[PDB]
Subunit: 261 residues, 2 copies
């Protein structure tokens, strides 16, 4: 029977990035955070789009999901560094800079960033599709998305942001990559630009909702707005999505409804 | 046609930036790109293109740009306190001194990813761009530059054999130099046989440059392992081999590479 979570986990475990060398632990360090855990939300968003539109491409989409998770994992490794979040644990295990050293954590993250593009470029898909996928990932994972969001999050931690600035921060830090996962699913399936763009825009909204939701369940929306208004902001957004959303296929729509959990 | 100036002008009008309320991220992105750099890797690539398909030279500038983005990101990360802990690079303070470590880490991360954005947007056929991305990500990533740097850092204070030292340098610097040449060939859709020969020449140049550095330092190292006499003899042997390899290239390309080599040495 079909289980996308298991399918991807097995794909990841069979395709860990590695290089033959006399370095005594680099391969182990590369694999560690990939194997340790991860809900693979971004991989699953992408695979859901593919399964709901062109299921015949599901196996070929696995490498694209893998590239997404390589980017996500590298980001976690760098963000956990002492200069930034300074985290001692991640995904149930010690962070790479604690198990090895800061150099290793920095370099493993660098390797995974670059390796995402090697894996994408080798995907079993037409070159025209792979170029679209690379554009989408590099735009949303790079300075136009994830990286500027992280830079803003770090720089303004000891400062104050307006609501609009806070929305900009989170939209870039996390929502862009979530939107990218959905859009890349559309691109694998060669969906029309209209639909792919609608799904991307929905992804941006879902990403913001996730961040506010997280702040609630607890640069925070609740600190800025208060709990009552934060819940109000989230609820509205489920609604804005609802209108926008209903246009996307009931098939995909329910799969997506589940992953948000 | 002055390829050096052509590329500098291209870089200066293609500095990566994003509109935001961050007070300095754009300036930090640009700082090391603008500050300096001999652009040796860019120039190797552009020389190949100019010599073979000059009608693609302008389109190739974006591919040269991607190479220099990778190279610059690597310098910024290598200069971090955890690694080389450098206070200056290209004549200015390092990013972690002018700004902070977080900025240096993230600017490097941005440039790594941006190399692929720029490459993917080049005005070249998608088939060519996929080949170029494969070449860059292989040679700049864990299969090349990154494993080279990890080895260099870990074994800085440990004894390496000659073969291990060769492995270190071939991965850390030679593979990206070879990639620059091979990427020029790929832009031109040069046959695999000549493209592979030119990649191998890049590997040799990379090794020659590192042996030359070890020799210059005394005037883990090749000199310590081989002795100054044998190290010089090895560099000279390798240079003579390169002379023969250059004779097998188009004469104009051979001269261009000779100029960039002599410049480097």
């Amino acid at each position: 029977s079909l289980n996308l979570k298991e399918l991807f986990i097995h794909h990841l475990e069979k395709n860990l990035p590695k290089v033959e060398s006399f370095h005594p632990f680099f391969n182990e360090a590369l694999a560690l955070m990939l194997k340790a855990g991860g809900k693979h939300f971004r991989a699953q968003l992408l695979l859901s789009v593919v399964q709901s539109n062109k299921p015949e491409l599901l196996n070929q989409a696995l490498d694209v999901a893998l590239a997404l998770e390589f980017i996500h994992t590298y980001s976690l490794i760098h963000d956990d560094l002492p200069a930034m979040d300074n985290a001692d644990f991640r995904r149930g295990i010690p962070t790479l800079h604690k198990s090895y050293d800061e150099t290793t954590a920095i370099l493993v993250g660098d390797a995974l960033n670059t390796e995402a593009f090697l894996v994408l470029s080798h995907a079993h898909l037409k070159d025209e599709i792979k170029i679209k996928l690379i554009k989408t990932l590099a735009f949303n994972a790079g300075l136009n998305g994830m990286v500027i969001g992280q830079a803003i999050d770090c720089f303004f931690e000891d400062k104050r942001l307006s609501l609009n600035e806070l929305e900009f921060l989170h939209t870039h830090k996390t929502a862009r990559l979530i939107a990218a996962a959905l859009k890349m699913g559309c691109e694998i399936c060669e969906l029309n630009n209209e639909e792919s763009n609608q799904i991307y825009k929905l992804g941006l909204k879902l990403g913001l909702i996730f961040q506010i939701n997280d702040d609630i369940i607890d640069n925070s929306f609740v600190n800025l707005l208060g709990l009552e208004q934060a819940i109000k902001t989230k609820e509205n957004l489920l609604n804005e999505c609802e209108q926008d959303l209903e246009k996307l296929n009931e098939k995909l729509a329910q799969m997506i409804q589940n992953l948000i959990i």
